[PDB]
Each structure stands twice: as C-alpha cells, then as structure tokens.
Design a protein around this ligand. Structure first.
Ligand SMILES: Nc1ncnc2c1ncn2[C@@H]1O[C@H](COP(=O)(O)OP(=O)(O)OP(=O)(O)O)[C@@H](O)[C@H]1O
Ligand SMILES: [Mg+2]
Ligand SMILES: [Mg+2]
Ligand SMILES: [Mg+2]
Ligand SMILES: [Mg+2]
Ligand SMILES: [Mg+2]
Ligand SMILES: [Mg+2]
Lengths: 50, 177, 85, 136, 314
RNA sequence: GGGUGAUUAGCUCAGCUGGGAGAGCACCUCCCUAACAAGGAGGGGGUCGGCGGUUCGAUCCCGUCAUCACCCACCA
RNA sequence: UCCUCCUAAAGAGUAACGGAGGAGCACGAAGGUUGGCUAAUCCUGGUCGGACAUCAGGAGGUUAGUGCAAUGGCAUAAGCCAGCUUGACUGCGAGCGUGACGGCGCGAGCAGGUGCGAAAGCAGGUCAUAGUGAUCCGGUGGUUCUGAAUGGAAGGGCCAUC
RNA sequence: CCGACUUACCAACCCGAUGCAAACUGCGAAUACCGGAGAAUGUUAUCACGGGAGACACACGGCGGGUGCUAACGUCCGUC
C-alpha cells in the first residue's frame, strides 16, 4: 500500500479530473497525460494534483 | 580484397581437385569471424567492460556489441542481464582484412609462439583460438591500455568436417603446430 | 479422570466460490448476437466465424445463428463458429 | 520395510479397491505367488513374507517383489474424538486385487519354491496361489 | 521552541533524549512482561480477559528512532603511500590582472592533513584544480609521488543525476563495488554512509542538502585514493556528521588536503596550515592551528579591528 | 493429549524485512616472575539445529521436523 | 472476507474442525499499437574461465517464460526486444452469464474526440481467474437544479471524488 | 598436481520389461445434461402475475464418495 491516490486535473480550465494511483517514491515527477475532457470535448493535457 | 581474390584463385583451384567436388559451390568458404572477450570482472565496475570494448574496437574495425549474462549463476555471483562480455562479428571485406592482418602481423607477435593447435576444431569445420594477450595486435599502443585482457577468435566457416576446415584454413598459411 | 477428552486443529479448510464456467449454449443451439457461448479460463475453445473473444476469453456470439463446434486447424484446436441460421 | 521416499502428497483418500489386477503374469522369474483374494498388503506383511522366502531358499535364487505400498494409511490417535482434521500416516499398504502376482522366484527348483511360497503366504492376510511361467 | 543559547539548548536536548530513551526502555520492559502474560494458559474456566489483550495490542506500537548519522563515515584505505607525496615549486597563477598565487612552494609529508584556509576566491579551489591536473599553472612545478592516487571532492555537488536513486548514483548499479584491492557489496558500502535502510531508494533530487553532501562523499571516496582533495566537505553537514567525518579523517593512513571555513573543524584535524593572504601570497605553516596562532603571537603585529560594517539603506 | 518459546565460538550470551560474525572468559604464543597467579602485548574459533521454501540476501523472513525448556489439561 | 486445485459422482452447483496452497497488491509501463524475434537443457571447440559467465556450431523442441498461489491457456505467441504514444478515453449499449436480492461479470455496435499502422485494422487497462467494504454521516471541486415574503446567501440536490 | 589404481556399490540420467496415483493424462465410456424434429399419451401436467401459507431439527435404505478403524442405529455431501 504505497501507491497513493492522485487526480489528474484538466488544463482546459474547467474543474474536471481523472483519478488514479501513483508510486510517490519511485515516481516523484508529476504525471502528465493527454486525456479526453468531456466538458470541452477535446483531448487535452491533464496534470497531476493532490 | 587483398586476400579475397587470393583465396578465390589458389584455395578454390586446390580444393576443386583435392576432394573431386563437382561444383564451386561445394568447396567450403569462411563466412565470419567472431571476436569474443568475456570480461567477467566487470561485475566490479563497468569501466572494465568499456575499456575492453575500446580495445576490441581498436583491434577490429567495428564497435563491439556488449553481451549480457543470459541466466543468473550463483557460482559466479552474477544475475540475468549483467553486461559481461563484448563481441564483434566480422563478415566480408572487414572479415578478410582482419584475417590477413592477423595471420600476418599478429600471430608472429605472440610471445613464445610455436604453432596453433590443429585439432582444435569443433567438429563442424569451425575453428577457435585464444590470444591471452591483446597487445599482440598492432593497434594497441601501450600508452592508453591498462590490462592484458585476452581475446578469443572464432573462425566460422561452411565446412562440414574438421578435415574440410583444416584443408580450407591451411591454404592461407595458418601457423598450425 | 482428567483424561477422557482430547482435541486438535487444522491448517487448511478454505476454498473459493465456484465461477460457473463451461459451455452455456451447446452445439446446434440458435442464439442472438451477444449471447455468451462458453465461459472459459484460458482458450479451451477458440473463436471461429461470427463469434468473438472477451478479455476473460469468454466466447460470445457476434451474429445470430446456430452454434457450431469444429476441430479445424494445424494444432487440432476446438473452434466455435456461428452460422447465420 | 518398503515405503516411498519423497511422496507428492502426505495423505490420501480411502478410495475403493474394486476390479481385477493388471500384473497378472509371472514376468521376471519362473514361479510366482499370485494373489487369489482381495485386500490391502501392508509394508510389514510385505517384509515378513519376504524374510520367510529368503530363509526358505537360503542364499540361492533371486526374488522379485512385484507389489509396492505407496499408499498412506492415516490413523487417528487413540481415545480421540471425531473431527479436528485427518489422522497422521502410520503405515503404507499396497492395494491388492485378485490376480496380482506378489512375489516371484527364480533359480530354485519348483519343489523348493513351492515350499518357500507356502511359508511366506502364511504371513499374508489374503489367499494366494502358486503360479508358474507360461509361453503366452 | 526554546529560549536560550546553543549550549543551554544542547543540555535541554540531551535531557529530552535521555528521558525518551528511558521511556522507550520502560515500554520494552512492560511489553515483555505483558507478552509473558499473554503466553500463559487460561487455568480453568476463568477469565484470561479481553480487556488486557486489547491493552497489550494497543501497547504494541511504533516509535521513531533518531536517524542520527554518527560515526560510520567510511573513508576506504588507499594504496600504500611513499614519503614523497606532493611538491610545488614557485607556483604562480593569475587571472587577467588579479593574481591569486605568487611564488608558492611547499612539500606535503605523508600522513598529513592540510587545512587550506583563506578568504573567498583567494585561489583555494584553483589550487585543487592544479593539483588534480584540470588547470595548468603559469610557473608549473606541481608533482606527485608515483604511489599517489588522487581522490577529489568538489565544492559543488552539481555533478549527480537527480533522477537516479541513492544506491544507483553511489554504486552505478553494480551489486559489487570495487574499491582498490577489495570488492565490496554496494548496498553495504552505501549503508556505511547512514543510508542503512530503504533510504537506498530515495532519489538524488529528493534528498536533502546534508544527505546530498553525505551521498557526494560516498560517491567520491569510492575511488580509493590515498591522497584526498576535499573542498568544503562539511557544507550542509550537521555536528554529528561533522564529528563522524573528523574521526574518519583522523583514522586515515594516507594524506588529505581539506579546504574549509570552519575554524574549529579545521583545527581539530589539521596538521599543516596552508593559509591565503593578500597580494596572492599563500603562507605555508607546518603545524596545527594552536601553534600557528602561537607563531603569529611570537611574531605579531599591533592591532585588532577587521571590519567596518558599512550599510544597506540610503 | 493440546499450545508457546529457544537453538549463534569450548562456556554464558549479543546480533539491521541483507551486508566474512560479535562481546566477556576460555584457548595459542610472547613479555613480566626464581617459578606460578595477577598484569601487559599480540592471535586464532563459527552446523548461525537440520535437507525445505516467496528472495538482489536468507542468521534474523520460509512450512516443517530434532532436541530441551515452559504452560494448560477445567465442568467431569 | 476473497482466489486456485481435489473431494465433486465427464453440464452448473454441491458439505465436513476434509486434503493442499495463496490474496488484502504491482505497473505511467509491466497499458495501446506497429515492426521484429523464439526458449530450457545438453554435447563439441574457445584466454585467464572452472560443474556452470561471454563466444561459435550441433542436438533438442517449449522440459522455458508469464510481476506474485494454483488451474486453464499462450507460436498468429498471451513469451522477448525496439519506435511512436495515452483507448488505464467520455456518453451509451443490442444481447447475454451469474446471483434470493444488494450486486457482479462478458459484450458487438452507435456518437464525440484520440493513439499507433501505408492500410486492412487494433486499442474503453494488464494471458484470465484474488488484490476487498453496503448504507449513514461528513469533507473537496463543479453545476444558479432548489433557495420558507422578495433579491442573494446558508443549507440541500445532481455530477466527480475523499 | 594431472587424481593411478578398488564397490560383496547409494544412485537419478538412456534402452527393455512390470506396477501405482483424489489434487497425473499422449486415451476414454455408460449415464446424466443442453438444443431441434416427430408422433402417441397425460383432468395445462409448463410459465408468468397476484392473495395465503407452512417450512429452513430431518430419519433410514440402495448407489457414488469424504471422514472414522475399508467401526457405529457415527458423521458430512450427491442422487433415488
Ligand atoms: N576563468 C576565470 N576567469 C576569471 N576569473 C576566474 C576564473 N575562474 C575563477 N576566477 C576567479 O578567480 C578566483 C579564484 O577562486 P576559486 O574558485 O579558485 O576559489 P576561492 O575563491 O579561493 O575559494 P571559494 O571557492 O571557497 O570561494 C575567484 O575570484 C574566481 O571568481
Ligand atoms: Mg485525492
Ligand atoms: Mg507483433
Ligand atoms: Mg470511436
Ligand atoms: Mg495515421
Ligand atoms: Mg448551492
Ligand atoms: Mg441431510
């Protein structure tokens, strides 16, 4: 149980987030993926947050 | 090449009559040279493997592929994937150039050299040899080396017998015993 | 008479719930598209014509028709197809 | 005392002993001791009949034991209730069905192997018969 | 929080740690006693009791031990050192029009620790550059004995890959580490520098400043040189790691040259003082700081006021 | 009959979810002494109970059996 | 509590203080694709180098491997390597399987956007089956849906999540 | 050192014979189960929905087994 829970917050400016887990020890660099944003209906960048 | 046409005349004419071959496709030819050097001690530090690869690339005009341990052996204190040796495959023109520049100016430089074993054939016509000392090649200038890391040659040919491999390799003036 | 009774223990005794695997619609049965045919663990049966394979390797009908079983192929494997009947 | 070394599973289901035997011929020696009856032959009885046969023919002759126990028989401790798991293995038996050739001899006369088998069969819990080799 | 000075705070800290150690020892005692009670039978049809079980289960807790470095700083012994170690003759270096070293000559006897002191940018690090051979002096004549093997520790840590883990950065990934003659397990060697647990997994960038200095020393002492060129080795270290390093430096067969600005740390180990002054003169003095000060008092000058304390505002 | 713990040098015992494996006294040599003791210098020791097992490592982790040490055998 | 095998009697299911083992995770690659590739073990020759390191050719043919138990499966590989990547998408969903229900699982296809591929195509996590906790109460973000005279607001609801 | 010579041999590797296995299978029934068609027979016997329940201590016998001692008017399943 070392994979803490993180949410990838959309960079489109809306408050939308996917939620996932991450090994905060072996992967200190913040996650960054291009996922779909149903609010704007465009694949945009999601960046890790708390 | 320098020795390619030499072979294609003398050795082909010899082996067409020696074994009553019906075709020039039947007389064996050498297909590659494999220069191996299993450093073994690079488990201590990668610097040794890098140095050995440098020496191998100096000796043979090709970058050496770094070979990693295939399976973990607890006896030798290594595990799967440890970079443990260097290896060069020489084919064609570079093959023949290295073959000539070996059998001309590298075997004579072997300390206390009196002949290479003639019975050291694997049974498939391929030959193997150890040098115990890399300095025997002219490319090592003694002013940038650190150790006496030995080297291994494997002459892989298409012969189907030890007699065939010996017959093919003697025509090049191989300093056997 | 503090000797009559005796006892012990055991280390096993646990199992898992059964997964109800096996053929659901047998050969010659007429099915609708999407109906599960076999619930497998590996690929005991392979997908043939007009049938598909899920992530569980469940074999489902991709069209509507009769189930068929075959042992075609170079490895003598059982295939489940569907004929549009 | 015959017993497997390094068995796969410690304990075994009781099972049922039906059917006729498979090794129903004298295949190594010249005479054999066929098992007419049915039952289980424990390792102690295997040895006791073996010791009887060797003494009856002294040093001479060769003897084959065609049956091996390989079957664990668990026994609960004395004066213990029911349940609380399965009992621990105490001995190994070989399941015997009619026709099973148990022992066979060679290199001794028939009149002597007839007597040697009669002495060993007195140690076994099943009916046996003296059987000889055939030409098939 | 604490109101007081450093020594009074230190006293308070020792008292706090002693009380914590005593309470932890009492906790161990009570836990062992209650475990002995738990490991008994019921004795009849009577209680035993679940309240005491719950009390023991909650008593079995975790306490945080101090991750105190202390004396484990491992300086590996280098090759045997002959009597001729280092010699400079009339060394001189200048940059543009400002000159840092002018006609400096000195020899380093074996076994010596050389405290190099002086103001900022006086040439302390450039001297190490010349000795290590990365800079070429104007007046030349820097020499080392043929037995000398050099191991150098820089003033700046900007050479480690912040991505790699502690164990990977120190050891390079090889499970066995070569240090001179003897092969050493990499994990054991890294743990010799206080990374004695799952601290091997931490990233270089995620490490702290003091841990960065410790990892720097661990990575740069593995070469096994019998001459050490340490440039400000106690930068981010605390008093505990500082004392550990001082002890390790004392138990060194080879010789070392240490540049530092901690007068006390330099005084506790230095056997030869190499002190920079104005107009690019590097006074060399064989002896420790006590006898250096005594020599200055023996041949001194009459004044005591260095600063001016100019200002900021207006 | 059910349960728990321990096993580390000749002895008594420490020992990190890894890292030749350590301490006292015992043993070896040499000093000291008429000679021993005591004292001082140097030195060596090991089945980590045993086949077993997830493991980058099994002493400490991994079912087990071997032994000795306990504990419980109540209403009956 | 959950997963694997046997008991379990060739559909499913099937008990015991029956016989054996495991789980309470891991992985932004160990996921997606597009290319490529094929093991274990042994024999022969070869410098330190041997019982076993790397090399060469011969047998062999998956006895190998799979992130972790066991079972089933895997060559078109599901195994191993590399480039580009985020489909570990959002709304749904014909039809099924399995449950007493709560629930759980499989799923073609549709719409919107996307990755890889020249394309056909594949991709809604991982070879599959364990890796888990109803509701209440409360927290965080979004949404004028509501807003106790009215306009706000508080508090609610809805969505995502702790 | 190269080991130079002894097994009235412990002994898996290959071959020839011969067994055993709930958790072995290069094989493999009878039955049972699933689906379709065809009659004859059966007061619809079938399914769905709705009103009302009771019951959820079972017993023995046959057959297939676990456990037990191939004990028990023992115990636990499957089927009649
Ligand atoms: N390439 C250069 N060109 C010009 N000046 C330089 C160059 N390199 C260094 N200097 C200057 O020369 C002086 C030498 O300083 P150096 O880096 O050697 O250490 P130091 O000042 O003695 O010590 P510290 O690092 O402790 O401050 C400094 O003033 C520095 O700024
Ligand atoms: Mg969160
Ligand atoms: Mg492919
Ligand atoms: Mg789409
Ligand atoms: Mg495209
Ligand atoms: Mg509101
Ligand atoms: Mg009943």
């Amino acid at each position: 149980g070392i994979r803490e829970k993180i949410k990838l917050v959309s960079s489109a400016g809306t408050g939308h987030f996917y939620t996932t887990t991450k090994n905060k020890r072996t992967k200190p660099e913040k996650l960054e993926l291009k996922k779909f944003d149903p609010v704007v209906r465009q694949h945009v960048i999601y960046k890790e947050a708390k | 090449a320098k020795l390619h046409d030499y072979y294609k005349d003398e050795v082909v004419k010899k082996l067409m009559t020696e074994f009553n071959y019906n075709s020039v496709m039947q007389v064996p030819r050498v297909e590659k040279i494999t220069l191996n050097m299993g450093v073994g001690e690079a488990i201590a530090d990668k610097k040794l493997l890098d140095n050995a690869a440098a020496d191998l690339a100096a000796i043979s005009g090709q970058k050496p592929l770094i070979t990693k341990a295939r399976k973990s052996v607890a006896g030798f204190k290594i595990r799967q994937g440890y970079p443990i040796g260097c290896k060069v495959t020489l084919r064609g023109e570079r093959m023949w150039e290295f073959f000539e520049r070996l059998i001309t100016i590298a075997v004579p430089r072997i300390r206390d050299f009196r002949g290479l074993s003639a019975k050291s054939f694997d049974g498939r016509g391929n030959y193997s040899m150890g040098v115990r000392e890399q300095i025997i090649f002219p490319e090592i200038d003694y002013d940038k080396v650190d150790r006496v890391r030995g080297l291994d040659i494997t002459i892989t040919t298409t012969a189907k017998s030890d007699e065939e491999g010996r017959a093919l390799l003697a025509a090049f003036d191989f300093p056997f015993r | 008479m503090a000797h009559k009774k005796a006892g012990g223990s055991t280390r096993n005794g646990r199992d898992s719930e059964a997964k109800r695997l096996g053929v659901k619609r047998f050969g010659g049965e007429s099915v609708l598209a999407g109906s599960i045919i076999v619930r497998q663990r590996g690929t005991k049966f392979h997908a043939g014509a007009n049938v598909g394979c899920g992530r569980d390797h469940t074999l489902f009908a991709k069209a509507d028709g009769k189930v068929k079983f075959e042992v075609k192929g170079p490895k003598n494997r059982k295939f489940i197809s569907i004929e549009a009947e | 005392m015959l017993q497997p070394k390094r068995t796969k599973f410690r304990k075994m289901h009781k099972g049922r002993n039906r059917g006729l035997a498979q090794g129903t011929d004298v295949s190594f020696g010249s005479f054999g001791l066929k098992a007419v009856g049915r039952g289980r032959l424990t390792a102690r009885q295997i040895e006791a009949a073996r010791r009887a046969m060797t003494r009856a023919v002294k040093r001479q002759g060769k003897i084959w034991i065609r049956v091996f126990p390989d079957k664990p028989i668990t026994e609960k401790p004395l004066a213990v209730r029911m349940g609380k798991g399965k009992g621990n293995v105490e001995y190994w038996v070989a399941l015997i069905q009619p026709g099973k050739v148990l022992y066979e001899m060679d290199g001794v006369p028939e009149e002597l192997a007839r007597e040697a088998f009669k002495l060993a069969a007195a140690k076994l819990p099943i009916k046996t018969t003296f059987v000889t080799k055939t030409v098939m | 929080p604490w109101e007081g000075n450093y020594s009074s705070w230190l006293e308070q800290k020792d008292q706090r740690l002693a009380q914590e150690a005593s309470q932890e020892a009492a906790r161990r005692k009570s836990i062992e006693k209650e475990l002995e009670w738990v490991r008994q039978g019921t004795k009849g049809r009577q209680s035993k009791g679940k309240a005491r079980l719950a009390r023991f289960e909650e008593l079995n807790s975790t306490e945080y031990q101090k991750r105190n470095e202390t004396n484990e700083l491992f300086i590996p012994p280098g090759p045997r050192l002959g009597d001729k170690v280092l010699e400079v003759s009339n060394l001189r270096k200048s940059y543009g029009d400002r000159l840092l070293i002018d006609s400096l000559s000195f020899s380093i006897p074996k076994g010596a620790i050389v405290g190099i002191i002086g103001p900022n940018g006086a040439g302390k690090s450039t001297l190490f550059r010349m000795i290590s051979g990365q800079e070429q002096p104007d007046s030349g004549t820097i020499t080392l004995g043929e037995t000398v093997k050099l191991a150098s520790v820089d003033q700046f840590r900007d050479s480690m890959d912040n991505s790699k883990t502690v164990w990977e950065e120190v050891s390079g990934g090889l499970d066995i580490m070569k240090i001179g003659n003897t092969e050493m397990p990499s994990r054991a060697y890294v743990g010799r520098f206080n990374f004695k647990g799952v601290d091997q997994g931490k990233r270089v960038g995620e490490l702290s400043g003091g841990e960065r200095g410790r990892l720097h020393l661990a990575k740069l002492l593995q070469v096994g040189g019998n001459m050490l060129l340490l440039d400000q080795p106690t930068n981010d270290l605390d008093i505990e790691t500082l004392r550990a390093l001082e002890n390790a430096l004392l138990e060194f067969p080879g010789c070392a040259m240490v540049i530092s600005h901690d007068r006390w740390f330099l005084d506790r180990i230095a056997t030869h003082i190499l002190d920079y002054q104005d107009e690019g003169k590097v006074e060399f003095f064989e002896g420790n700081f006590t006898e250096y000060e005594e020599y200055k008092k023996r041949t001194l000058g009459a004044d005591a006021l260095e600063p001016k304390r100019i200002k900021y505002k207006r």
